[PDB]
Amino acid sequence: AMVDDRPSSARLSVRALDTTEAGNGFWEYLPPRYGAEPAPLMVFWHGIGENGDGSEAALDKVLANGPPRYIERDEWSNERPFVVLSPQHAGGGCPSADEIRDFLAFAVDTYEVDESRIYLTGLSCGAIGSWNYLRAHLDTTPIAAAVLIAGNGRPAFNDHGCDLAQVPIWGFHGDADPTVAPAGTIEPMNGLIACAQPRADQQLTVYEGVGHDSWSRTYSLSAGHDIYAWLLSQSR
Ligand SMILES: [Cl-]
Ligand SMILES: [Cl-]
Ligand SMILES: [Cl-]
Structure with a gap:
């Protein structure tokens, strides 16, 4: 097949609320081969600093960190096969379990995605919400894996x-985080790792001496943890 090979920002589109x-x-990012075969799906949830009302103007905040930052900057490899959706949470705190459920339902209903490869990821509030999403919806969640940073x-x-160990999770945290205590990731990942086989893959990465921003070095691969290859190795 012939394939679009323009840089990633060429396929980044704003999808304002309503x-x-x-x-x-x-933010909607479509991979080069979108439409050719069902694509894996990644839904990314931002941190509290980037909350806004979902308008076009407000959505610019969400470009600050994570996948949409690298996509907007043409630093997201064209080899990556994911549809990447980056919703904006409105209001004062973290996205709720049901908000994340509803948006995942929307995503799967709307895009040509491989439902055996739905990936959830977030940083800070976005990770906190994703963890709460799993707490509420473990028995019905369609996701194949999660990468949860500083949650x-x-x-x-x-x-x-x-029971939670049936979902593959890679948790990341800086151990000097003064904002979200690193026990928030370390305790559950240690618990999940200790769970007996058969269970899903479980991974924990602790960045020693690192504060609250443990996401930049994770999503950019500057820290050498290939979360994308790991996600793609998981499926339902
Ligand atoms: Cl910057
Ligand atoms: Cl609120
Ligand atoms: Cl590093």
Whole structure:
């Protein structure tokens, strides 16, 4: 097949709140081969600093960190096969479990995606929300794996224990984080890793001496943890 090979920003589109069926404004990134075969899906949730009302103007905030930052800057490899959606959370705190559920339902209904390869990822509030999403919806979640950075999964693991270990998770945290305590990732990932086989893959990365921003070095691969290859190795 012949394939679009323009840099990633060429396929980045703003989808403001109330221009789609979604309950969030979001950034839409389509991979080069979108449409040719069902694509893996990645839904990324931003941190609290980037909250906004989902309008086009407000959505610019979401470009600050994570996948949409690299996509907008043409620093997101064309080899990456994901549809990447980056919704904006409105209001004052972290996205809720049901907000994340509803947006994942929208995404799967709307895009030509491989439903066996739905990936959830977030940083800070976006990770906190994703953990809470798993706590609420573990028994029905369609996701294949999650990469959760600088969040708090203690309630989710306290609730479910090794039942949660059926979802593959890679948790990341800086151990000097003064904003979200690193026990938030370390305790649940240690618990999940200790869970007996058969269980999903579980990984924990602790950046020693690193503060709250443990996401830049993760999503950019400057720290050498290939979260994209790991996600793609997971499926339902
Ligand atoms: Cl910058
Ligand atoms: Cl609020
Ligand atoms: Cl590093």
